[PDB]
Design a protein around this ligand. Structure first.
Ligand SMILES: [Zn+2]
Ligand SMILES: [Zn+2]
Ligand SMILES: [Zn+2]
Length: 245
């Protein structure tokens, strides 16, 4: 997903997903210790820096190839042979974040958590779970899709306190993989002959621009809602793991 501005949700779907996940945690009054939400907000600057940095600097964006932002659950690979994938990478920062947290280095801890959350967010994007890049046919569709998502994301906010608590085991890798499995299933609802066809014809006919945009909205809403719930659960897992217990 997009991460155009470090501190603005308008053009940062990643930040939006995390903020909506935090809201889910705040709405939950039966399981979540609100002191956890207070900590996230206390180091929000470092958290947002991490969410943003993943798409703009090494080693996070893999020399501008973004290889680590992809993960196909069926073969466990990214789109470039032998490159690092989102599962091992997101898990790496989940653990680095916890170690810093236990050593009381809050700035380092939340920066790394932000990075981990970025990768978790990406596998919720069907294209990232199917190795469909901005160079895949139709080329350019990937970036335009993510650009469009920013214009409608606010219509799919989760308004209850039900995150996927303890969704998968205690291994962060399981959550990333699990999210990817669900995302890849919803792939066809976004990339198919119709949307491909219309996206191509959209170059000359605005009428077709509206057609593919409307076509991918339903599945997009479902993916964004799931991403919020899974992210809330992931954050809860992090605190339960490194919050001393
Ligand atoms: Zn992204
Ligand atoms: Zn993308
Ligand atoms: Zn990314």
């Amino acid at each position: 997903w997009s991460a155009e501005d470090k501190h603005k949700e308008g053009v940062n779907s990643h930040l939006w997903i995390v903020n909506r996940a935090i809201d889910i945690m705040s709405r939950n009054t039966t399981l979540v210790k609100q002191d956890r939400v207070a900590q996230l907000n206390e180091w929000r600057t470092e958290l947002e820096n991490g969410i943003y940095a993943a798409n703009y600097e090494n080693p996070y964006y893999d020399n501008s190839t973004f290889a680590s932002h992809f993960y196909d659950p069926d073969n466990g690979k990214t789109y470039i042979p032998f490159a690092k994938q989102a599962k091992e990478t997101g898990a790496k920062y989940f653990k680095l974040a916890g170690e810093s947290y236990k050593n009381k280095d809050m700035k380092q801890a939340f920066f790394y958590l932000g990075l981990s959350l970025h990768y978790l967010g990406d596998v919720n994007q069907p294209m990232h779970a199917a190795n469909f890049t901005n160079l895949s046919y139709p080329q350019g569709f990937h970036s335009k899709y993510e650009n469009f998502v920013d214009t409608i994301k606010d219509n799919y906010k989760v308004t209850d306190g039900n995150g996927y608590w303890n969704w998968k085991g205690t291994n962060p890798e399981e959550w990333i993989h699990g999210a990817a499995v669900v995302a890849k299933q919803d792939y066809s609802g976004i990339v198919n002959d119709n949307t491909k066809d219309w996206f191509v014809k959209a170059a000359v006919s605005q009428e077709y621009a509206d057609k593919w945009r409307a076509e991918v909205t339903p599945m997009t809403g479902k993916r964004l809602m799931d991403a919020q719930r899974v992210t809330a659960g992931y954050i809860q897992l992090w605190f339960d793991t490194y919050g001393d217990r």
